[PDB]
Amino acid sequence: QWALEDFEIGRPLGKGKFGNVYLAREKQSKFILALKVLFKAQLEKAGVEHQLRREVEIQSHLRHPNILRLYGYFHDATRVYLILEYAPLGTVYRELQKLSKFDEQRTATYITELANALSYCHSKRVIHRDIKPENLLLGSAGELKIADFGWSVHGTLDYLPPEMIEGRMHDEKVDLWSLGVLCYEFLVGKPPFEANTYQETYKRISRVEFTFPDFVTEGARDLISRLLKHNPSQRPMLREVLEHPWITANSS
Numbered sequence: 001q002w003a004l005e006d007f008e009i010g011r012p013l014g015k016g017k018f019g020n021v022y023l024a025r026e027k028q029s030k031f032i033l034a035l036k037v038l039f040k041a042q043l044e045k046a047g048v049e050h051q052l053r054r055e056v057e058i059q060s061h062l063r064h065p066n067i068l069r070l071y072g073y074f075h076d077a078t079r080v081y082l083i084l085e086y087a088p089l090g091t092v093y094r095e096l097q098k099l100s101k102f103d104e105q106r107t108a109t110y111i112t113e114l115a116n117a118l119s120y121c122h123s124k125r126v127i128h129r130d131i132k133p134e135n136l137l138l139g140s141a142g143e144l145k146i147a148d149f150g151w152s153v154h155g156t157l158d159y160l161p162p163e164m165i166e167g168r169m170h171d172e173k174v175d176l177w178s179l180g181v182l183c184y185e186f187l188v189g190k191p192p193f194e195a196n197t198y199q200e201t202y203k204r205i206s207r208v209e210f211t212f213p214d215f216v217t218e219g220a221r222d223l224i225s226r227l228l229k230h231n232p233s234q235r236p237m238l239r240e241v242l243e244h245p246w247i248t249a250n251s252s
């Protein structure tokens with residue numbers, strides 16, 4: 001379909017696992033996009049050549065103002081290139097280092113943008129493992145865009161919920177956990193179950209051992225508490241998140 005020839009490639013936007021993401025421009029149209037290079041090599045030799053074909057396909061056909069568009073793809077000798085919407089304000093990760101914590105307005109805002117993006121994603125039966133802040137890009141007006149592609153129906157642990165590490169059966173509730181983690185991390189500046197070892201983060205996640213710094217408000221504590229429940233069934237539905245004294249008081 002497309003080829004390396006169709007694009008002027010520019011500066012590096014960052015390094016991924018299996019290659020880098022370049023800034024690029026389609027020549028006939030001068031459309032500005034991102035162009036993700038993944039080497040066939042470290043997909044062959046990591047057992048994922050299968051895995052991405054599925055994520056692409058899932059991604060290939062879903063569309064939402066807060067989900068990163070995949071436009072298309074192609075390949076050459078030993079490289080595969082994906083073709084992405086380009087997010088100019090980078091990752092929420094950098095925004096979080098640059099700022100350390102987020103105020104309640106922006107935090108509630110991002111959680112709204114996410115719930116939406118996710119409830120739409122629920123409406124078509126899709127889900128999310130790698131739902132973490134380095135996988136959250138910011139668009140030209142300042143809005144979230146999920147950029148991790150994420151699965152349908154069957155690693156650092158900070159963002160995994162209990163059900164996925166104790167090896168159990170797991171459903172859309174997984175995303176509810178992620179929002180609690182993401183919410184906590186936006187406000188506090190670090191994930192609720194952070195540790196220095198994989199093996200402690202497990203106990204910490206398994207039991208749901210987290211505490212709040214003094215500066216975190218009764219209303220946030222409540223939402224985060226509702227979201228971070230060991231039993232998945234006990235966690236809310238996304239509409240209850242959206243309509244929540246706190247979210248509602250603080251979003252845009």
Ligand SMILES: Nc1ncnc2c1ncn2[C@@H]1O[C@H](COP(=O)(O)OP(=O)(O)CP(=O)(O)O)[C@@H](O)[C@H]1O
Pocket residue numbers: 013014015016017018021034068084085086087088090091130134135137147148
């Ligand atoms: N579409 C885009 N627009 C702007 N910047 C992007 C982008 N895609 C990627 N980047 C930048 O390049 C980095 C590497 O890409 P990406 O994060 O997708 O790699 P990756 O999936 O292999 C590892 P992970 O998903 O865990 O971060 C991103 O963290 C981001 O800084």
